[PDB]
Write a protein that binds this ligand. Structure first.
Ligand SMILES: Nc1nc2c(ncn2[C@@H]2O[C@H](COP(=O)(O)OP(=O)(O)OP(=O)(O)O)[C@@H](O)[C@H]2O)c(=O)[nH]1
Ligand SMILES: N[C@@H](Cc1ccccc1)C(=O)O
Ligand SMILES: [Mg+2]
Ligand SMILES: [Mg+2]
Ligand SMILES: [Mg+2]
Ligand SMILES: [Mg+2]
Ligand SMILES: [Mg+2]
Ligand SMILES: [Mg+2]
Ligand SMILES: [Mg+2]
Ligand SMILES: [Mg+2]
Ligand SMILES: [Mg+2]
Ligand SMILES: [Mg+2]
Ligand SMILES: [Mg+2]
Ligand SMILES: [Mg+2]
Ligand SMILES: [Mg+2]
Ligand SMILES: [Mg+2]
Ligand SMILES: [Mg+2]
Ligand SMILES: [Mg+2]
Ligand SMILES: [Mg+2]
Ligand SMILES: [Mg+2]
Ligand SMILES: [Mg+2]
Ligand SMILES: [Mg+2]
Ligand SMILES: [Mg+2]
Ligand SMILES: [Mg+2]
Ligand SMILES: [Mg+2]
Ligand SMILES: [Mg+2]
Ligand SMILES: [Mg+2]
Ligand SMILES: [Mg+2]
Ligand SMILES: [Mg+2]
Ligand SMILES: [Mg+2]
Ligand SMILES: [Mg+2]
Ligand SMILES: [Mg+2]
Ligand SMILES: [Mg+2]
Ligand SMILES: [Mg+2]
Ligand SMILES: [Mg+2]
Ligand SMILES: [Mg+2]
Ligand SMILES: [Mg+2]
Ligand SMILES: [Mg+2]
Ligand SMILES: [Mg+2]
Ligand SMILES: [Mg+2]
Ligand SMILES: [Mg+2]
Ligand SMILES: [Mg+2]
Ligand SMILES: [Mg+2]
Ligand SMILES: [Mg+2]
Ligand SMILES: [Mg+2]
Ligand SMILES: [Mg+2]
Ligand SMILES: [Mg+2]
Ligand SMILES: [Mg+2]
Ligand SMILES: [Mg+2]
Ligand SMILES: [Mg+2]
Ligand SMILES: [Mg+2]
Ligand SMILES: [Mg+2]
Ligand SMILES: [Mg+2]
Ligand SMILES: [Mg+2]
Ligand SMILES: [Mg+2]
Ligand SMILES: [Mg+2]
Ligand SMILES: [Mg+2]
Ligand SMILES: [Mg+2]
Ligand SMILES: [Mg+2]
Ligand SMILES: [Mg+2]
Ligand SMILES: [Mg+2]
Ligand SMILES: [Mg+2]
Ligand SMILES: [Mg+2]
Ligand SMILES: [Mg+2]
Ligand SMILES: [Mg+2]
Ligand SMILES: [Mg+2]
Ligand SMILES: [Mg+2]
Ligand SMILES: [Mg+2]
Ligand SMILES: [Mg+2]
Ligand SMILES: [Mg+2]
Ligand SMILES: [Mg+2]
Ligand SMILES: [Mg+2]
Ligand SMILES: [Mg+2]
Ligand SMILES: [Mg+2]
Ligand SMILES: [Mg+2]
Ligand SMILES: [Mg+2]
Ligand SMILES: [Mg+2]
Ligand SMILES: [Mg+2]
Ligand SMILES: [Mg+2]
Ligand SMILES: [Mg+2]
Ligand SMILES: [Mg+2]
Ligand SMILES: [Mg+2]
Ligand SMILES: [Mg+2]
Ligand SMILES: [Mg+2]
Ligand SMILES: [Mg+2]
Ligand SMILES: [Mg+2]
Ligand SMILES: [Mg+2]
Ligand SMILES: [Mg+2]
Ligand SMILES: [Mg+2]
Ligand SMILES: [Mg+2]
Ligand SMILES: [Mg+2]
Ligand SMILES: [Mg+2]
Ligand SMILES: [Mg+2]
Ligand SMILES: [Mg+2]
Ligand SMILES: [Mg+2]
Ligand SMILES: [Mg+2]
Ligand SMILES: [Mg+2]
Ligand SMILES: [Mg+2]
Ligand SMILES: [Mg+2]
Ligand SMILES: [Mg+2]
Ligand SMILES: [Mg+2]
Ligand SMILES: [Mg+2]
Ligand SMILES: [Mg+2]
Ligand SMILES: [Mg+2]
Ligand SMILES: [Mg+2]
Ligand SMILES: [Mg+2]
Ligand SMILES: [Mg+2]
Ligand SMILES: [Mg+2]
Ligand SMILES: [Mg+2]
Ligand SMILES: [Mg+2]
Ligand SMILES: [Mg+2]
Ligand SMILES: [Mg+2]
Ligand SMILES: [Mg+2]
Ligand SMILES: [Mg+2]
Ligand SMILES: [Mg+2]
Ligand SMILES: [Mg+2]
Ligand SMILES: [Mg+2]
Ligand SMILES: [Mg+2]
Ligand SMILES: [Mg+2]
Ligand SMILES: [Mg+2]
Ligand SMILES: [Mg+2]
Ligand SMILES: [Mg+2]
Ligand SMILES: [Mg+2]
Ligand SMILES: [Mg+2]
Ligand SMILES: [Mg+2]
Ligand SMILES: [Mg+2]
Ligand SMILES: [Mg+2]
Ligand SMILES: [Mg+2]
Ligand SMILES: [Mg+2]
Ligand SMILES: [Mg+2]
Ligand SMILES: [Mg+2]
Ligand SMILES: [Mg+2]
Ligand SMILES: [Mg+2]
Ligand SMILES: [Mg+2]
Ligand SMILES: [Mg+2]
Ligand SMILES: [Mg+2]
Ligand SMILES: [Mg+2]
Ligand SMILES: [Mg+2]
Ligand SMILES: [Mg+2]
Ligand SMILES: [Mg+2]
Ligand SMILES: [Mg+2]
Ligand SMILES: [Mg+2]
Ligand SMILES: [Mg+2]
Ligand SMILES: [Mg+2]
Ligand SMILES: [Mg+2]
Lengths: 393, 60, 82, 205, 85
RNA sequence: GCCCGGAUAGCUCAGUCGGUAGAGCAGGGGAUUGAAAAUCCCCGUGUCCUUGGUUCGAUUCCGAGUCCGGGCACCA
RNA sequence: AAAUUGAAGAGUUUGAUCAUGGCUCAGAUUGAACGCUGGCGGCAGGCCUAACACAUGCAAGUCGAACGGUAACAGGAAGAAGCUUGCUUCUUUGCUGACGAGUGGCGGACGGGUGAGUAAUGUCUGGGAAACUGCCUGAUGGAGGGGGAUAACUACUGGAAACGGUAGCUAAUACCGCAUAACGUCGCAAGACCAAAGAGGGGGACCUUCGGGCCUCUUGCCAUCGGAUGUGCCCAGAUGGGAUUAGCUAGUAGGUGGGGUAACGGCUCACCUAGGCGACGAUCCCUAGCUGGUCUGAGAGGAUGACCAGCCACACUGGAACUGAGACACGGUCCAGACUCCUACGGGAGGCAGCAGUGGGGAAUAUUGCACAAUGGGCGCAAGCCUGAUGCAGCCAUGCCGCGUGUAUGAAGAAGGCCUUCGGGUUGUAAAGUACUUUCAGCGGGGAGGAAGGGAGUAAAGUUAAUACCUUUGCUCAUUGACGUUACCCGCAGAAGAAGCACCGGCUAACUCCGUGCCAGCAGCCGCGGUAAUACGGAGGGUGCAAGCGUUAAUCGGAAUUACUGGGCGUAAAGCGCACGCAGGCGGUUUGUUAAGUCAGAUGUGAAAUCCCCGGGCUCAACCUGGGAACUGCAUCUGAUACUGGCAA
């Protein structure tokens, strides 16, 4: 919090997706040291991407860490996802703000169950674009074996409804690029080119009023409570009235500084991850799931009608009927919440793979409007996508 | 101390943090405080209309 | 060093200055020996505007007390023969 | 700040005519006056000593359009002033601008006189005044400004003031809407019905 | 410290280096008189008294010693010379 | 942000390794009184914390949650 | 001509009674909190708790008119070199202004903050002698001549930095002898003594050796004695609770010899005497800043010490001293500590109870805001710096006060609710309406008042050798506003954007219907519910306040329920079981004298503020303010001598 962030080069939210222990987090560490050395940005290291006791004694990542690497054309902002089966909830917050992912499948193991589960969550939430990266390569010195894995990833993406064959598959070791190998340094410089070429300039909404979902709350020693997250729409000026709506109730507030990776800002525009500092709020009372809206724009609701599209076995979901009293998890912008289902009259049962409308009473109120997209999940897997129809409360 | 839970029904159980005001009940010997309905985990009484600052309920 | 200076009393946007003989080190509003008239900048043309007891000024200025920028001009405003 | 409810309800509870719903017509005969305070109007009240004091206080309040907090302040002023505490209570109430504007005849009711004071219409000693509580000093000249002079609400309301008793302490021109407040009002001049003694009892305990 | 007027720290330290040397000089000349007093007649003591008198007066006038300190060191010390010898 | 424990009829507790849960104590509900206590005759009065799955069948086996308990971290 | 004009009760023990006596209630107030609900302005105020720990930033510097600096900056002048000969390159010049790095004379000790400590080293009231004083200002007298350094700045090393070195060069209002100076120190005296500094704006005349010698004018420096402001010291009384703390004390108590202090003194020694304190409560223990005041009270009192003002104390904890006129120093030095920091691991830091802010504590108290424009203060010849002291505004129904949310007409006395003596009443002039106004925010044009000045070049009148510079009064100028899209004055539209929430058995202003049935719940006190509840939940109906209302906690009141004014003790609580008796309290009667008490006048003084009357400015109030009394005080000389005491017989 000292240097002013100059608004030059378009902002893009990138992040690594893939299987457990697959060079997902190590790729992010390779991207920093490669781009910092040649172009001449800020250095950083692989340690700062994941410290704590939880990501050292174990080794695995839980928290969605963030990184800022700059290139001549654009200014990227990384989101390193966790990857494991237990950490799907805090991943979806990292994956929702991500515009164009970098998928991570490896040349020794290949596509494994989580890779299918990750890309499934990317479609229903919001992941337009995706780039493959083979994160081992050197361990198996062979031309025939390494290229057989490329075929199966093209099959996976195309089977699940992505381009597949059009996606630029890249090969390169992360640990070799970390030290200083001229061939492998240049091969991950090539990935920075593939991010620039394939992913276009993202479409933001800097017109309709301010909204910002809170991904992770902080308490800065000196300033007060800081909320992070991508600004979904509108803008944020310093010393402007902001209403925090969602779980519990609703509180008034005012912004006292917006920032971009420990650098000051005047206007926090849409489509970019920013840390908003709120005035006169405690760490405990403000929680994860609430949204920073402009006063009057949005209202918290505990009941709503919604056109729910339930999935079948082929698309990946439930395979049995259910009656009123069923309680699955509804993932709106960031957080999840449980809610009882009340079906319409003249509908005895809800079969899998069917379009119907239904009233859903949530246990916690969340800020919502008509035409909001969500993805229902239960039992460590997906259930059904849909849209909000009418407000009731 | 012991505090009286004024109103029909309550959300208090085992733990749950509540606010306390002064006032004897004059019936239960020992009890000499009142829970503030509305504040913190102690919710309002369900479906009250008359006298709602007492018993912590909003407008209908 | 003793000094004749204003005290600044009255409400917000509606000041009223108690010209007063006080020590240099002591505060504006605080300690003094004796007050000597007053001044009102929001009086306008009416019955009363400014009053300043010139007999007590001879006791202090004659001995060895400075007059501040504002109080020196009120001695010119009240005049000797005007 | 104001009552702004059913105004003729206040006259039935109190019994006597309060000049709230006076207006264009002289006598109402349009409420079942006296014998219908509310649903239970036929119920004969037992009426204690604290009752009759508070009924007397609220009557003098609802006639002049003042609230307890401001009304108590008049009593505190009245006690400190010279003479009799009872006579000063009502002498201070009669010196209000919205009451003097009503007594001049520039307003069919006192709420109309209060609004006419508030609406930049009333002007006294060449100075516009908005405050209904403005204490009108002896030897003054209240009047209506030239923009709002001879508007449709005032001319009809001035013709009502001919049927009224008309105070001796103040004088009205009537042609150019110009008033002249002369002396302080005396007890014997006005009312001869609302008791002051009982309102001094309510506040002294 | 967080001020540019720490010159007074180094200026006061520079002062007491000087201030102690002139002070220590004075009290040794006074000790020279007390040394002469005890076993001695009115001769050796008064010679030392004539030497210390200009030094105590001078130091008094600079603002090291006060004028009464000097006055006592003449008064009480002359009373030692006069009474004993 | 993640690890762990806790929840069984109105209250205090038994019972489970798929065989479909019980005990006291409250309360019932006619007798009786103005209405109880007592005496008399008959009653479990249940979303096994919620919800789904493996199955013929789940309190009981395996997920996901609820609010609460205690534990370890992150500083735009 | 005005300053106190001053005092309410009620419920509740019983079958009923009178008494006793607790309990509770109505009233004020508050640094307030919560709950429902909320619209605006005036002035106020806004960490009471963890004197808990604190990132971040900004809160004290300032003079070139003290000197070194002819320079780290930026720019004129004598002269230079390129070439578009005035466009460019560029050495000298206190020389252009200044002011970065410096050494001095002053400031930092004031301004602010916070009550940890302190039950008397404090405060308050009234007195005193042994003091000192920067700045300012009264009056006198100087203002003789020399020297030695030293920083910066090269240089050279140490070191990561923080900081010091090692060889120098070099001013001065820095520094130090010297000669002198009594009305200034020393004893009685002849004697002995001690002080200093030059700057800056001008000059005719004559020295020019040009550094200008020399005249002026200001500021500044001299010992003295002053005034003012203080600041230390002392005494007397007053200034909480506990005797289930009764004995405490050896520099303790005096005296002198010595010693120190601005100065009195066990302040400190050496001796000498062996006391001093304590029932008029020592000592010890717990609690506590103190006062002006605030609050309540008819007053006596009781409570209290937020906010403004005085005094004290403290500055991360515990010491210590230095520098000065002033400190044992809030952003000084120094140790030691604990707890954060930066380290190249040798050694370095650091101190919000200054302003915002964070965590944490909590029932709970505010923005990392805005400006020096004013008003002080710091600096300075002033041109201006710095001033989170003042000024403002963010936030906050947290207060005291103002205006809002409409205003006339309105019968079918609509409907719907609501009770029904199913006839009807009631909510109800309420609504709908039918006329008119538009306060207030919300748009927009005008636009006071906080502002005195400061500055330039000027006239005169002072100043003087002088029509120069300087100063003063007339005197011409241009301007300075953070608040600020001010306060306020006119135009836009159309009731338009703007009402709750307590209560309703008695106390205590105000009724019914259902639902429930000693269950569910209310409860400030009595007490409400067992199938016809006025007390419970709902509804209507009312009543009371309303931008607030209730609840809560807290103080006084009522409580004559600690009674001095102003209570009691046969049986209600309460006469020791009964004597003797020291200290203590009280004391018959008559003259004389003192005056302690008492009384009367006297002068001092009770800081200013509030509190109280006669006024005045906020459009009105609230607020603000001018004067008056008040400040029931406490001391001091003079008398009165009845009464009380002292002393007489
Ligand atoms: N040979 C090789 N090993 C790698 C590479 N990247 C990572 N690894 C290994 O895997 C670990 C890196 O973590 P990854 O699993 O890649 O990334 P991650 O985000 O920690 O994975 P998740 O647990 O899914 O979050 C390291 O301990 C390496 O030993 C690579 O490029 N090559
Ligand atoms: N926008 C943020 C992203 C972030 C979130 C949380 C931790 C670190 C980074 C930056 O900084
Ligand atoms: Mg592993
Ligand atoms: Mg990962
Ligand atoms: Mg707060
Ligand atoms: Mg009720
Ligand atoms: Mg003026
Ligand atoms: Mg003027
Ligand atoms: Mg000054
Ligand atoms: Mg009001
Ligand atoms: Mg009654
Ligand atoms: Mg008037
Ligand atoms: Mg009274
Ligand atoms: Mg230091
Ligand atoms: Mg020596
Ligand atoms: Mg001196
Ligand atoms: Mg000196
Ligand atoms: Mg029966
Ligand atoms: Mg029966
Ligand atoms: Mg008089
Ligand atoms: Mg009875
Ligand atoms: Mg009785
Ligand atoms: Mg108050
Ligand atoms: Mg509130
Ligand atoms: Mg509002
Ligand atoms: Mg406002
Ligand atoms: Mg207000
Ligand atoms: Mg504070
Ligand atoms: Mg207090
Ligand atoms: Mg101070
Ligand atoms: Mg102050
Ligand atoms: Mg303060
Ligand atoms: Mg204080
Ligand atoms: Mg003292
Ligand atoms: Mg004193
Ligand atoms: Mg002296
Ligand atoms: Mg000075
Ligand atoms: Mg000479
Ligand atoms: Mg020499
Ligand atoms: Mg020489
Ligand atoms: Mg040298
Ligand atoms: Mg040297
Ligand atoms: Mg020189
Ligand atoms: Mg020179
Ligand atoms: Mg000198
Ligand atoms: Mg000599
Ligand atoms: Mg001589
Ligand atoms: Mg002499
Ligand atoms: Mg002498
Ligand atoms: Mg000689
Ligand atoms: Mg000299
Ligand atoms: Mg004197
Ligand atoms: Mg006290
Ligand atoms: Mg002896
Ligand atoms: Mg009173
Ligand atoms: Mg009393
Ligand atoms: Mg009083
Ligand atoms: Mg304070
Ligand atoms: Mg004082
Ligand atoms: Mg401090
Ligand atoms: Mg300190
Ligand atoms: Mg200290
Ligand atoms: Mg001190
Ligand atoms: Mg200091
Ligand atoms: Mg200190
Ligand atoms: Mg150190
Ligand atoms: Mg230290
Ligand atoms: Mg500090
Ligand atoms: Mg602070
Ligand atoms: Mg501190
Ligand atoms: Mg905080
Ligand atoms: Mg703010
Ligand atoms: Mg500023
Ligand atoms: Mg500015
Ligand atoms: Mg600024
Ligand atoms: Mg400033
Ligand atoms: Mg300015
Ligand atoms: Mg100033
Ligand atoms: Mg000044
Ligand atoms: Mg001067
Ligand atoms: Mg000048
Ligand atoms: Mg300035
Ligand atoms: Mg500064
Ligand atoms: Mg500032
Ligand atoms: Mg404003
Ligand atoms: Mg107030
Ligand atoms: Mg208050
Ligand atoms: Mg009306
Ligand atoms: Mg009604
Ligand atoms: Mg009406
Ligand atoms: Mg209408
Ligand atoms: Mg109408
Ligand atoms: Mg019109
Ligand atoms: Mg206005
Ligand atoms: Mg004009
Ligand atoms: Mg002006
Ligand atoms: Mg000025
Ligand atoms: Mg001038
Ligand atoms: Mg301006
Ligand atoms: Mg300006
Ligand atoms: Mg404003
Ligand atoms: Mg305007
Ligand atoms: Mg405005
Ligand atoms: Mg017009
Ligand atoms: Mg118009
Ligand atoms: Mg009642
Ligand atoms: Mg009765
Ligand atoms: Mg009643
Ligand atoms: Mg009936
Ligand atoms: Mg009740
Ligand atoms: Mg009936
Ligand atoms: Mg009933
Ligand atoms: Mg009502
Ligand atoms: Mg109230
Ligand atoms: Mg109370
Ligand atoms: Mg009492
Ligand atoms: Mg009493
Ligand atoms: Mg008595
Ligand atoms: Mg008694
Ligand atoms: Mg008895
Ligand atoms: Mg007895
Ligand atoms: Mg006896
Ligand atoms: Mg006996
Ligand atoms: Mg005796
Ligand atoms: Mg006698
Ligand atoms: Mg006699
Ligand atoms: Mg005689
Ligand atoms: Mg006599
Ligand atoms: Mg007198
Ligand atoms: Mg006098
Ligand atoms: Mg006096
Ligand atoms: Mg007051
Ligand atoms: Mg005041
Ligand atoms: Mg007045
Ligand atoms: Mg106005
Ligand atoms: Mg006065
Ligand atoms: Mg006054
Ligand atoms: Mg006076
Ligand atoms: Mg007088
Ligand atoms: Mg007078
Ligand atoms: Mg006074
Ligand atoms: Mg005599
Ligand atoms: Mg006689
Ligand atoms: Mg006696
Ligand atoms: Mg005797």
């Amino acid at each position: 919090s000292k240097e002013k962030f100059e608004r030059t080069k378009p902002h893009v939210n990138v992040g690594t997706i893939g299987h457990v222990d697959h060079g997902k987090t190590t790729l992010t560490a390779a991207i920093t040291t490669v781009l910092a050395k040649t172009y001449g940005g800020a250095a950083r290291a692989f340690n700062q991407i994941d410290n704590a006791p939880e990501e050292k004694a174990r080794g695995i990542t839980i928290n969605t860490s963030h990184v800022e690497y700059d290139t001549p054309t654009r200014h990227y902002a990384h989101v390193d996802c966790p990857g494991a089966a237990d950490y799907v909830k805090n991943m979806i917050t990292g994956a929702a703000q991500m515009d164009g992912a970098i998928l991570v499948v490896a040349a020794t193991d290949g596509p494994m169950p989580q890779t299918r589960e990750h890309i499934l969550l990317g479609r229903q939430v919001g992941v337009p674009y995706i780039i493959v990266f083979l994160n081992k390569c050197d361990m198996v010195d062979d031309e025939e074996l390494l290229e057989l894995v490329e075929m199966e990833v093209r099959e996976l993406l195309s089977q699940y409804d992505f381009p597949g064959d059009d996606t630029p598959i890249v090969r390169g070791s992360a640990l070799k690029a970390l030290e200083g190998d001229a061939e492998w340094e240049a091969k991950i410089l090539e990935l920075a080119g593939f991010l620039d070429s394939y992913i276009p300039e993202p479409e933001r909404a800097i017109d309709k009023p301010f909204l910002l979902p809170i991904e992770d709350v902080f308490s800065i020693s000196g300033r007060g409570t800081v909320v992070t997250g991508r600004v979904e729409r509108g803008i944020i000026k310093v010393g402007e009235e902001v209403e925090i709506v969602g779980i519990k109730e609703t509180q008034k507030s005012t912004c006292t500084g917006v920032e971009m990776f420990r650098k000051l800002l005047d206007e926090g525009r849409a489509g970019e991850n920013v840390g908003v500092l709120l005035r006169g709020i405690k760490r405990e009372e403000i929680e994860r799931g609430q949204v920073l809206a402009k006063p009057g724009t949005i209202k918290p609701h505990t009941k709503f009608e919604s056109e729910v599209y339930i999935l079948s076995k082929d698309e990946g979901g439930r395979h049995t009927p259910f009656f009123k009293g069923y309680r699955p998890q509804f993932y709106f912008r960031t957080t999840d919440v449980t809610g009882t289902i009340e079906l319409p009259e003249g509908v005895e049962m809800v079969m899998p793979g069917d379009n119907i409308k239904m009233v859903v009473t949530l246990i916690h109120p969340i800020a919502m409007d008509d035409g909001l997209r969500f993805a229902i999940r239960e039992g460590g897997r997906t259930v059904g996508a849909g849209v909000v129809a009418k407000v009731l409360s | 101390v012991t505090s009286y839970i004024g109103g029909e029904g309550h959300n208090l159980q085992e733990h749950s943090v509540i606010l306390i005001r002064g006032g004897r009940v004059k019936d239960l010997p020992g009890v000499r405080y009142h829970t503030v309905r509305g504040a913190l985990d102690c919710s309002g009484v369900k479906d009250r209309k008359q006298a709602r600052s007492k018993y912590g309920v909003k407008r209908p | 060093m003793v000094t004749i200076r204003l005290a600044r009393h009255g409400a917000k946007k509606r000041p009223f200055y108690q010209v007063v003989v006080a020590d240099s080190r002591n505060a504006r509003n605080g300690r003094f020996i004796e007050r000597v008239g007053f001044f009102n900048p929001i009086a306008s043309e009416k019955e009363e505007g400014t009053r300043l007891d010139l007999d007590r000024i001879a006791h202090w200025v004659g001995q060895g007390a400075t007059i501040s920028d504002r109080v020196a001009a009120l001695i010119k405003e009240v005049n000797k023969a005007a | 700040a104001r009552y702004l409810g059913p105004k003729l309800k206040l006259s039935r509870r109190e019994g006597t005519d309060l000049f709230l719903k006076s207006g264009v017509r002289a006598i109402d005969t349009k409420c079942k006056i006296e014998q219908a305070p509310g649903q239970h109007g036929a119920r004969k009240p037992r009426l204690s000593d604290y009752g009759v004091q508070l009924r007397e206080k609220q009557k003098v309040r609802r006639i002049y359009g003042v609230l307890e907090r401001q009304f108590r302040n008049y009593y505190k002023e009245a006690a400190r002033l010279k003479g009799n505490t009872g006579e000063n209570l009502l002498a201070l109430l009669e010196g209000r601008l919205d009451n003097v504007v009503y007594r001049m005849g520039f307003g069919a009711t006192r709420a109309e006189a209060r609004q006419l004071v508030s609406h930049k219409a009333i002007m006294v000693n060449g100075r516009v005044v908005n405050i209904a509580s403005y204490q009108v000093s002896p030897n003054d000249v209240v009047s209506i400004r030239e923009k709002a002079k001879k508007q449709s609400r005032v001319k009809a309301a001035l013709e009502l003031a001919e049927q009224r008793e008309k105070p001796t302490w103040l004088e009205v021109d009537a042609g150019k809407m110009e008033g002249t407040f002369k002396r302080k009002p005396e007890r014997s001049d006005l009312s001869a019905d609302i008791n002051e003694h009982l309102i001094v009892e309510l506040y002294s305990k | 410290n967080i001020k540019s007027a720490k010159k007074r720290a180094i200026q006061s330290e520079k002062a007491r280096k000087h201030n102690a040397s002139r002070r220590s000089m004075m009290r040794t000349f006074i000790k020279k008189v007390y040394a002469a007093i005890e076993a001695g007649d009115k001769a050796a003591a008064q010679k030392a008294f004539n030497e210390m008198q200009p030094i105590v007066d001078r130091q008094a006038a600079k603002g090291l010693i006060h004028k009464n300190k000097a006055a006592r060191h003449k008064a009480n010390l002359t009373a030692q010379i006069n009474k004993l010898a």
